[PDB]
Amino acid sequence: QLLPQALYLSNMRKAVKIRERTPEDIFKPTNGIIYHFKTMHRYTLEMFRTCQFCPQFREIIHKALIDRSVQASLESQKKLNWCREVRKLVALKTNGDGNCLMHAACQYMWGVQDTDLVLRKALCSTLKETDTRNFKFRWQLESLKSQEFNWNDEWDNLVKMASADTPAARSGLQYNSLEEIHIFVLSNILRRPIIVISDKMLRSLEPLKVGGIYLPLHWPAQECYRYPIVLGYDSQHFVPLVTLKELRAVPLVNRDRGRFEDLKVHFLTDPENEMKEKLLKEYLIVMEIPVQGWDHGTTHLINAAKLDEANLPKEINLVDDYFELVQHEYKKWQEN
Structure with missing residues (x-):
């Protein structure tokens, strides 16, 4: 197997x-x-035509590049790729070092990870130097709409969790774990919605609300980029759920317990709950689609947000270089 375990390797230059x-x-x-x-x-990155090759060989391309443990788990719980009316999203392999939130978000749109930690250092030097009044208010809103148990002190704690350097090594891990209020900020810095596709099946083992839309609400509207970054969160892990190149969109609903349930939208004040539908479309490109309903025979109508087109120039796009790599390796595959 001469195919690299990741995309960015293909051309490290x-x-x-x-x-x-x-x-x-x-x-x-x-x-x-x-x-x-x-x-x-x-x-924005978009994965390539893998079904064009022979199946004996597709496995080689898959097992290397795709996080089969997380793609299975998300698929298996009717949360990933559940809508037959829409294109498939595939999970790519991120270094799960407690900075994998970032490794994924950079992967989603460059092909590289946050290996030089520019994003992590962005988040870390944001919280500190800029005005963060708007961000604290939101955070201490979700926080006592839950738990109930000193919120003034816990803030300076969240930013030093976002430390650039190694913390107390959790499991020998490189970097400190991130959470919901961090994903909000990163949306804002990128001025780009983030949609997390979270695990819902945790039943037996001896209770998070991570999944959902994350919107650039510190920033004003359509002037921002209104095409989502889609990420998958399964175990303790972030993967970019990268679409490919049906029409391309992500559903804004959830197939659970026999009902189409809206995706959570994070850190929203009571006034914004009424705008919630109108808060999208301004920040996404929402478009209604007759998905197959609850069997029997009723196309149920729900919304979804169209995704972005692959727009990285070959000057900075890696996938294209991988694709060449797999082609030549398949050309030998047909020699023998």
């Missing part, structure tokens, strides 16, 4: 080009507003 172009494409004003990207936040 291009991967490094990307890494180098990443903090360059980050805009930095200094007047109390959060940091963000210039152009690269608009990028």
Whole structure:
């Protein structure tokens, strides 16, 4: 098996080009507003035609690049790829070092991970230097709409969890674990919605609300990028759920307990709950679709958010270089 375990490996010279172009494409004003990207936040990756090759060989391409443990688990619980009316989303392999939130979000749109930690360091130097009043208010809203048990002190704790350097090594892990309020900020910095596709099946073992839409609510509307970053969270792990290149969209509903349930939208005040439908479309490109309903025979109508088109130029797109790699390796596959 001569196929690399990841995408960015295929051309590490291009991967490094990307890494180098990443903090360059980050805009930095200094007047109390959060940091963000210039152009690269608009990028988006899309996995390639894997069904074009022979099945003896598709396995080789799959097992290397796709997180079969998480793709299975999400699929197996009617949360991944459940809608026959829409294209398939595949989970890519991220380094699960407690910075895999970022490894995924960068993977979703560059092909590289957060290996130089520009994003992690972005998040870390955001919380600190910029005004974070809006962000705290939201966080201490979800927080006492849950738990019930000192919230003033727990904030400075969340930012040092977002430390650039190694914390107390959890399981010998590299970096400290991230959570819901972190995903909100990263949406804002990227000025781009994030949709997490979370595990719902935890029944036997001796209770999180991570999944859902994360919107750039610190930032105003359609001026932002209104095409989602889609991520999968299964165990303790983030994978980019990258679409490919039906029409492309992600469902805004959940097939659970025999009902179409809306996806949670995070950190929302009472006024924004009434805008919630109108808060999307402004921030996504919502479009109704006759999905097959609860069998018997009733096309049930629900909404979904169309995804973005693969727009990385071959100057900074890695998948295209992988694709060449698998082609030549298949060309030998047909020699013998």
